């Protein structure tokens, strides 16, 4: 019974910074590669970031390179995403996903997600 | 280990047009993943540049 | 373009009741399935309730079954959610969301949200 | 450049019981005068220990 839960997020004015947390349970979590994806209004899913099972390999997209940062604590079963220089386009529902077998076989479990609204 | 990390840290500490939250945010980014030290600085100096009323 | 707005909500003492209304515009309201979800500040999203395009199919979550109730008026382009026997844990920002291509396929447009506070 | 400097840099950067203002303050002190780095590390640890709860 795998379960992931997101935490953090809310209303911030443009140019600010946030930090998101993801709490996993009921699996090893240090054997699976993890990923963050977001969903803007009106558009499809957009991939954001990923981290390897052990750490030490982090993958980012171009819409957010230099602004976001991913990290994981395999001893607390936790995965963090740090947001900086936030813009109005970054408002979305952010999801925490487990990849089976690396980048090869897709996602199998999601979170409930968390909402990030950026306005004035 | 990475000297570029430490140099980008001191680069961001002395940026005038940032406030405490943005300064600490980019510092936290240097903490989580020290490989992106160059990229973070590029987007930090950019933001500082946009916050000057000169 | 699609536009949704939430209305109603505010401060009530514990054990009280409120009623939320959602006004949709600029799309066919009777073909898409709608839902209400809530998020407390600083924590993630929680799914609350959902209804099919025509009505007559209603699904609720386990924390609030028998306490909240969902309904839709396809002739007024309106969607209602009534809350009863409110507790202090039920305080959150409530959002009105449209599901694309049925239930299990996610969201594409939500509203601005409204605040529900339960305290003494 | 100074090996005494950077080890105290990473020491103070990873001090848990400080808050962001104290961390950045002692680290800025390591920049202003690299000769006092050892002393800077002593008074930060001393503060960090006294600000930890059980």
Author numbering:
A (entry chain D), C (entry chain A): 1 to 120
B (entry chain H), D (entry chain B): 2803 to 2856
Original authors' sentences:
Single-domain antibodies (sdAbs), including camelid-derived nanobodies and human-derived variable heavy domains (VH), have emerged as a transformative class of biologics due to their small size, high stability, and superior tissue penetration. Derived from Staphylococcus aureus, Protein A is a 42 kDa surface protein consisting of five homologous immunoglobulin-binding domains (A–E) and an S region that functions as a signal sequence and cell wall-binding region (XM). It strongly interacts with the CH2-CH3 region within the Fc domain of IgG1, IgG2, and IgG4 and can also bind certain antibody fragments. Using this approach, we successfully reprogrammed multiple human-derived VHs and camelid-derived nanobodies to acquire high Protein A affinity, enabling efficient, tag-free purification via industry-standard Protein A affinity chromatography.
The sdAb n501 is a fully human sdAb we previously identified that targets the oncofetal antigen 5T425. It exhibits nanomolar affinity for Protein A and can be effectively purified using commercial Protein A resins, achieving higher purity and comparable yields to IMAC in a single step. Next, we co-crystallized n501 with the domain D of Protein A and successfully determined their complex structure at a resolution of 3.57 Å. IgGM accurately predicts the interaction between n501 and Protein A (DockQ = 0.834, RMSD = 1.29 Å), whereas AlphaFold-3 incorrectly docked Protein A to the CDR (DockQ = 0.028, RMSD = 13.11 Å). Analysis of the crystal structure reveals that the interaction between n501 and domain D of Protein A is predominantly mediated by FR1 and FR3. Specifically, FR1 and FR3 were found to interact with helices II and III of Protein A domain D. Further analysis indicated that 12 residues within n501 are involved in this interaction, including G16, S18, R20 from FR1, and T65, Y67, K72, G74, T77, S79, Q90, N92, and R95 from FR3 (IMGT numbering). The domain D of Protein A contributes an additional 12 residues to the binding interface, including A28, Q29, G32, F33, Q35, S36, D39 from helix II, N46, V47, E50 from helix III, and K53 from the interloop connecting the two helices. Seven hydrogen bonds are formed between n501 and Protein A (G16-Q29, S18-A28, R20-D39, T65-D40, Y67-D40, T77-S36, N92-G32/S36), along with two salt bridges (R20-D39 and R95-E50). Additionally, residues K72, G74, S79, and Q90 of n501 primarily interact with Protein A through hydrophobic interactions.
